[PDB]
Amino acid sequence: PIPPGFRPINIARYGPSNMQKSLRDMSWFLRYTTYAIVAGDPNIIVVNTRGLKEVIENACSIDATIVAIQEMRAASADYFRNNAQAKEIVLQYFDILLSEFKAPTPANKVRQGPSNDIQGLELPQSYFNAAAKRQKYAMKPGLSALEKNAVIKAAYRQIFERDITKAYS
């Protein structure tokens, strides 16, 4: 549908091993698309396609990958074509896949050493996209009673490892 600037790739010039890598990458893209369809959350696609452009662009054509997943979306849509209530899920998951795959690699999260004794660290921005994020509780002054009591109970759970005002008042 939208080929930006791609050129088709010759098999003999591309080499056998790179062609096998391309074929298993295409089948793996379709496999994880089906797995995300089953899971109901595109988080697997987001994590495993967010940083893929920089590593894949060194020896593989990024426009060819874009046209490849474009043809995958079109072929899956026309071969499925059941109804609008079940086709827009596949369409939006392939759109999420192409947007995350065209998105370049974000900055790795850097854990600064708080002092001289403690080593500073780095963490890629794909590990902190699937690993069950902590719910952050911030006490804004205007908050209503329900979320204020939620923040107070979360603070009690943090300090005392449990909800003591529920367990023992």
């Binding site: 939006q92 759109d95 947007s99 998105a103 804004k140 205007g142 908050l143 979320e147």
Partner: protein
């Protein structure tokens, strides 16, 4: 914070009466609009980086604030500003899904204007970025959802100004 439903519950509760006809058919209007609100939230959640991208593209780039002497010049300042605009899109999405504007002065408009004055952040160019984020969202999702998105973005710019 509250919603359309929580707002009508409170606005009935302050006289302590049950649900009247006006509450009933405005909740009918809310439930009629709700699927459109979820579709708009879904499409801007899917495209959410690109809306901020086009907003900073036709708002703040090639400008005197991006030139040295401005507050967009340094790259840490640029990253902080685009992170702020992404947070504004996320909180405007929250307001649009919730149906009420209380989440803005609940969460973002607590102290934003005066801490921006403390940091020397240009309020006028920030309001221009809000107008840009308005028109890019209205171009993406259409006029019908874009107008009610622009209601809470007008709330953002009026609270910040």
């Amino acid at each position: 914070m509250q919603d359309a439903i929580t707002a009508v519950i409170n606005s009935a509760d302050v006289q302590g009466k049950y649900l009247d006809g006006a509450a009933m058919d405005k909740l009918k209007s809310y439930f009629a609009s709700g699927e459109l609100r979820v579709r708009a939230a879904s499409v801007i959640s899917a495209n959410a980086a690109t809306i901020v991208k086009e907003a900073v593209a036709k708002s703040l780039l090639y400008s005197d604030v991006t030139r040295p002497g401005g507050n967009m010049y340094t790259t840490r300042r640029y990253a902080a500003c685009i992170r702020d605009l992404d947070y504004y899109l996320r909180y405007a999405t929250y307001a649009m899904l919730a149906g009420d504007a209380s989440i803005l002065d609940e969460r973002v408009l607590n102290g934003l204007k005066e801490t921006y004055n403390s940091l020397g952040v240009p309020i006028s160019s920030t309001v221009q970025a809000i107008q840009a984020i308005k028109e890019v969202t209205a171009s993406l999702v259409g006029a019908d959802a874009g107008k009610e998105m622009g209601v809470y973005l007008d709330y953002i710019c009026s609270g910040l100004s």
